[PDB]
């Protein structure tokens, strides 16, 4: 309750959104193990 604490809800949309787009270009079942 003391400066910021308001878009910080609108900085996290973009991050989940950024996320998602970033496990596009991931290769299922490259490594050995």
Do not use: D
């Amino acid at each position: 309750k003391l400066f910021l604490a308001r878009l910080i809800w609108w900085l996290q949309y973009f991050i989940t959104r950024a996320e998602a787009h970033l496990q596009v270009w991931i290769p299922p079942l490259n490594v050995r193990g």
